[PDB]
Amino acid sequence: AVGIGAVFLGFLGAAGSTMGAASMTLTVQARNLLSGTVWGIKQLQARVLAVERYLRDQQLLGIWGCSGKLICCTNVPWNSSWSNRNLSEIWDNMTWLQWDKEISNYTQIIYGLLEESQNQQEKNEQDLLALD
């Protein structure tokens, strides 16, 4: 549309496009997650719930391979039973909503695999810096 050619606009703007197009615009959805006599309690619990959710996400990233790299290749493989689709098709064919509907079952095992991979990389790096 207006943002054709130079593919960007405001946050949640890429939510309709395919995930390959939406992957180039991730900094703003990361950005619009933190900043934004009894009603002060409501304002305060909203603000601390926002920073608690953001800190939980940053801690979930920080125990994995990437602290703030925002795109992280890692060392765990991919079971093809989970996706069971053509690989380059999903980046030109699927929205992130539809993809999250697809792998709703296949969740929370990936995160433990990531933690095992990161702890294995840490003990391997400890051994490597130990014998040197």
Epitope: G112, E115, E116
Partner: antibody
Framework: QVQLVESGPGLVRPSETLSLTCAVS?????????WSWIRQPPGKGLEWIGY????????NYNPSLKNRVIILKDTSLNQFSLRLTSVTAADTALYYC??????????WGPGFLVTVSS | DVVMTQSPLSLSITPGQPASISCRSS???????????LSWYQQKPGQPPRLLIY???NWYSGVPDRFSGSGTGTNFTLKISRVEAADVGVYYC?????????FGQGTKVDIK
């Protein structure tokens, strides 16, 4: 005082996805424990299928089960479920949910005969 | 994996007389702390088994002291110094120190 009770089929066709679910009362799931599945073919010895943990251990199975077993815990319902994809009629066995603790498998389930038949 | 063997495979008990099962594991079950993760079970038909002795010197809650257990290396020993009619079933020797968990074959025990 822990009580484990299995639930699910006992008669399924081969080459299908088998799934049981054991309910747990008398204690909590997220304990120093491995909520485990152990089977026994009829007239034969036991066969340990695998476990899951109430902490954050990754579940570790018997490699003879050919990576078709996914035990999934349900802490919001105090349960933990066996899975077995692509079953055969030779997989007919009594199934048991149990709890490894500081002692070895104190409270079992009653154990139900899953007779895989076509 | 760990291989378990019980000897004898069948022993019809004489009431008033002891009985024994020698367990043989394939590998050393003594963990580096100093303990031994070995357990004994007793098959009842269509039932969860009855549990006699875990961690050989230790005792289950719910087990009378008319049993006994010892052992060296991989040769462990369950003994019943006074058998009863309540000792029906087919026993088990099962390790717990190595993944994967394994169990045994068992000793057949009936009335003589």
């Amino acid at each position: 005082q822990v009580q484990l009770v299995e639930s699910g089929p006992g008669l399924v066709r081969p080459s299908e996805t088998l799934s049981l679910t054991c309910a747990v009362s008398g204690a909590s799931i997220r304990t120093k424990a491995w909520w485990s599945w152990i089977r026994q073919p009829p007239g034969k010895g036991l066969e340990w299928i695998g476990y899951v943990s109430g902490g954050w251990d990754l579940p570790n199975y018997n490699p003879s089960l050919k990576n078709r077993v996914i035990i999934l815990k349900d802490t919001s319902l105090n349960q933990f479920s066996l899975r077995l994809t692509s079953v055969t009629a030779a997989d007919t066995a009594l199934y048991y949910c149990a709890r490894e603790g500081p002692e070895d498998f104190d409270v079992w389930g009653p154990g139900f005969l899953v007779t895989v038949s076509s | 994996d760990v291989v378990m063997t019980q000897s004898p495979l069948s022993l019809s008990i004489t009431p008033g007389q002891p009985a024994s099962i020698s367990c043989r594991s394939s590998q050393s079950l003594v963990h580096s702390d100093g303990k031994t993760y070995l357990s004994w079970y007793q098959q009842k038909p269509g039932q969860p088994p009855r549990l006699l002795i875990y961690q050989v010197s230790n005792w289950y809650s719910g087990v009378p002291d008319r049993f006994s257990g010892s052992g060296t290396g991989t040769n462990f020993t369950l003994k019943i110094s006074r058998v009863e009619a309540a000792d029906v079933g087919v026993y088990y020797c099962g390790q717990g120190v190595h993944l994967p968990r394994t169990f045994g074959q068992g000793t057949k025990v009936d009335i003589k």
